[PDB]
């Protein structure tokens, strides 16, 4: 899996190949990169390790597969929720904001964005 | 692999067990094993095999893994939008409502309800 760390306070960007499976954190990885994410607490509440995560390989929207043609059949017959179709018509690649010390790390290739500040 | 199929028109849930793959469709084995959903058309536009499809196995909200603990920190920062609290804040295992000539068949586990009117 290869994860780029991206921040203010760097002036590049960091490419890391991190092993999918073994227990890791992506707040583990990063410490282990010399990735500067802000670590202030062990009980995971204090929101400093906020990153902004986009999703590089797999679906575009996470756990919504349905084609374009497929969402419109279903808005003829009223079948589609209304919060399902504002999150599908997203024009960009939409970022998912997560606290590395609560994300496992996966064979997915992310971009994670952090601003460096502790907050 | 194994799909679930019920539906007023029979007595008695099916029990299937499909292989998987990125070519078949739901509505495929359905016919194949003879459930009869209603299959009008070739181009996918009419909505007649609409189905209502529970995910038994993997992820309970698709693509949304956070703990509750950690939605408490995003949503205290701001940084968790409503719409993705909506989601995983359900109670009920949700359903999703998909048409099964454009339902790609892989080898997690659905229960799928379609009501037996060809509509
Ligand atoms: S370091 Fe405190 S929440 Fe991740
Ligand atoms: S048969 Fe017309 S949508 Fe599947």
């Known amino acids: ?3 780029y760390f991206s921040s ?3 002036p590049h960007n960091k490419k890391v190949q991190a092993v999918a499976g073994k227990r890791s954190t992506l707040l583990g990885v990063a ?3 010399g990735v500067k994410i802000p670590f202030e607490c062990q009980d995971g509440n204090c929101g400093s390790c906020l990153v902004k995560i986009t999703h590089l390989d797999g679906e575009r929207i996470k756990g919504m597969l349905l084609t374009d043609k497929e969402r419109n059949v ?6 589609l929720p209304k919060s399902e179709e504002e999150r599908a018509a997203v ?4 970022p998912t904001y997560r606290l ?5 790390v996966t064979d997915e290739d992310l971009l994670v964005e952090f601003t460096g500040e502790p907050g």
């Open 91 to 94: 024009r960009d690649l939409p």
């Open 8 to 10: 203010p306070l760097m």
């Open 100 to 104: 590395a010390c609560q994300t496992i």
């Open 74 to 79: 279903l808005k003829s017959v009223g079948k």
């Open 31 to 33: 410490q282990e990169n």
């Open 1 to 3: 899996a290869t994860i």
